[PDB]
Amino acid sequence: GSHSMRYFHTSVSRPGRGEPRFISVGYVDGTQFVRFDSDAASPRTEPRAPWIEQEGPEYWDRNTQISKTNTQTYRESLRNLRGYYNQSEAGSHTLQRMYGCDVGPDGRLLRGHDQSAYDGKDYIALNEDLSSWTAADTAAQITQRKWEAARVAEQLRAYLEGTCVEWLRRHLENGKETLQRADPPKTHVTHHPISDHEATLRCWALGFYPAEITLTWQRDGEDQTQDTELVETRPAGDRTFQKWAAVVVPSGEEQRYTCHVQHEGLPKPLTLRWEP
């Protein structure tokens, strides 16, 4: 369907323990395909999915240089942020940034992203127009003024609408057998007596890709949102994801409950019941 390329940057200061570590990971949808870590013995942009391995030395060299420059920029940014918040030199702080682009089923740009957080709180973001910023506070307004003066948004828009989308489309073609394959969940319902009075019905979805999925329980056709325990979708380690949803039901009322599953890999949505 639609697809995204995203890079996730984390920089973490550690006073007294050297310079801040910088790590970048790149994803196409739910698939990681590159990493760069300043704490590696020899920092380098490294392949993390088989389909990216065919890129030639120019790709590895250029991305390693960009990431080494970014290590320095993020360390300067962390020094600046400690000042903008009047913080001590003693504490550790975190700067995160995510950026990238989304395309629709025909490869056309849907939208771009570039947004940053400091100590886990939103700091500044490029608006969806790719032309203006939203600053969270008066510290981020300093960054916004600097980026307005330097016409940074125009540079990011050129990247997002150009390089980013072109590379996403290239990756989607090179990895078409996996990136453009949706694996449906394998689904089943388990039953776990709790007491004489109640039992848990757990609806499982296993082996699916990508991670977006809808998994719900209904009782007599009504959604049970407040009474359902829904675990976070979790990686299996083999590219796929897992999830389950559980409801506590009165003993004898199991057939009033239905589990409903929607996912891209399924030809039609599923309705399941406990099958004793």
């Binding site: 890079y7 940057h9 970048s24 790149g26 942009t45 790709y59 250029r62 991305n63 960009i66 990431s67 420059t69 970014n70 920029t73 993020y74 300067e76 940014s77 600046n80 942020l81 700067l95 940034r97 950026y99 940053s116 700091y123 500044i124 960054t143 600097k146 980026w147 330097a150 940074v152 540079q155 990011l156 990247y159 390089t163 980013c164 590379w167």
Partner: peptide
Amino acid sequence: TEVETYVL
């Protein structure tokens, strides 16, 4: 390919 980011 990645982009060179800008100092905050």
